[PDB]
């Protein structure tokens, strides 16, 4: 699997990659929150959609 990581070395050749890495490290505050909120919304709707549909054909 890991033999894919070498693809990233395009970073030097490509502005987009480094500039994206930075626009992500800067907004790394809201992505932790997004992961969190998604995790909670998923658990909520998973429990619901389970019990509202656990017993069927």
């Amino acid at each position: 699997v890991f033999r894919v990581f070498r693809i990233f070395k395009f970073s030097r050749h490509s502005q987009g990659l480094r500039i994206l890495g930075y626009t992500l490290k800067s907004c790394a505050s809201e992505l932790g929150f997004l992961l969190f909120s998604l995790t909670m919304a998923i658990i909520i709707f998973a429990t619901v959609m389970f019990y509202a549909e656990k017993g069927s054909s």
Binding site: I43, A46, T47, F50
Partner: protein, 58 residues
Amino acid sequence: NPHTSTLALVFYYVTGFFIAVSVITNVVETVPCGTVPGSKELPCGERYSVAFFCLDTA
């Protein structure tokens, strides 16, 4: 403001922990876990009903 003291901070940090613990176990009850070599598969919550029950109580 938990940041008021250190005891307030650690209390907030420990109560915001058992919420997560109860969420996790409320999820895990529905897991089919353990082969149950004798009969059908019991959702892990009901197989160990004593453990899950006592944890929910606490």
